[PDB]
Design a binder for this molecule. Sequence first.
Ligand SMILES: *[C@@H]1O[C@H](CO)[C@@H](O[C@@H]2O[C@H](CO)[C@@H](O)[C@H](O)[C@H]2NC(C)=O)[C@H](O)[C@H]1NC(C)=O
Ligand SMILES: *[C@@H]1O[C@H](CO)[C@@H](O)[C@H](O)[C@H]1NC(C)=O
Ligand SMILES: *[C@@H]1O[C@H](CO)[C@@H](O)[C@H](O)[C@H]1NC(C)=O
Lengths: 149, 191
Amino acid sequence: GNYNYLYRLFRKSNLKPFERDISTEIYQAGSTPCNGVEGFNCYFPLQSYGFQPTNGVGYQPYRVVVLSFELLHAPATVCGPKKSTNLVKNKCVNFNFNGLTGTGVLTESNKKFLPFQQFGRDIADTTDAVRDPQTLEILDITPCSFGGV
Amino acid sequence: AYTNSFTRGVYYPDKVFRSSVLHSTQDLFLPFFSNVTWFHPVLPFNDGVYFASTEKSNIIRGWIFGTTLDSKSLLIVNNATNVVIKVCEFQFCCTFEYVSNLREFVFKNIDGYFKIYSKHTPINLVRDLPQGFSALEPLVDLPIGINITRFQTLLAAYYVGYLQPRTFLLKYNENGTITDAVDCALDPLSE
Ligand SMILES: *[C@@H]1O[C@H](CO)[C@@H](O[C@@H]2O[C@H](CO)[C@@H](O)[C@H](O)[C@H]2NC(C)=O)[C@H](O)[C@H]1NC(C)=O
Ligand SMILES: *[C@@H]1O[C@H](CO)[C@@H](O)[C@H](O)[C@H]1NC(C)=O
Ligand SMILES: *[C@@H]1O[C@H](CO)[C@@H](O)[C@H](O)[C@H]1NC(C)=O
């Protein structure tokens, strides 16, 4: 029986998202103050898992990894295996800047981006300008010509 | 002591550039014309804090955060030329380690992330915070995941205010800097 893995069994309130509580304060389950002394209604908040190879699959140990990432609002440092391509201006093209995809014309801009800002936005919440991930230059995005026939 | 936080405490709520627009956004802000406490001590960290310092030789350097604040919590300290943030249960009179006029900071703890915004601006005044407007761009997002209910500075007077969930109407100019704002609950005209 492997008892090295623990879980918190008691707590005065539920955890907020991504909160981390490693405290070992004695939990007072009754009206008697514990004063740091374990006993009746005074429990150690942690309890060990019972992991034996003969245990049922429901009681078998599982390893869990949760990847948390926030999507495009700022410069990025973790990308997929996707390759890159040269850049062409003044022609309607399909652009993909750091996973932000779209279609339009990219032109030299006069916008003054701050170091923590990746891409701009239009009044319609559509992207208006972007920062080229390889060259620190601001490209203005203008949808290419259209109209009724 | 107490003083009036005329229009300060506004910070870029998003890392997205905008220009020549009036954008409305709701978040934890410092209400306009609020009573901010002036210290020439431990304080609560209810829902975020606006801190301000006027310095001549940079006496104030550090912050302590936590519930009990004594070896059972965050610590921040500016050693000469190196910001140092730790979450060890330090001994004062580890699961994280980070290493890098008027100064204004905003501290927020949302979903276990500690957001620190900080501006800087020269001023010639010795009474209180000057009247004016400026925006506090973000500087740090920290994945502490640590409970917060109190803080205390470490040092030159300073100013402390508290944030509330108030809607604001930020004015982005041609160059993308917030030049003006309107608290949506300050007064009838503001509404
Ligand atoms: C973070 O720590 C604070 C301690 O300051 C917790 O607040 C306590 O919550 C319990 C819940 O029943 C109350 O009985 C205490 O009176 C609270 N203490 C204070 C000083 O207000 C808070 O619950 C903790 N956060 C979470 C998510 O549990
Ligand atoms: C990445 O691109 C920039 C500009 O395109 C260049 O200066 C830099 O050397 C490149 N880095 C590598 C590792 O090739
Ligand atoms: C924007 O920057 C230009 C210089 O690039 C300057 O002339 C202009 O005054 C700035 N606009 C504002 C509103 O500060």
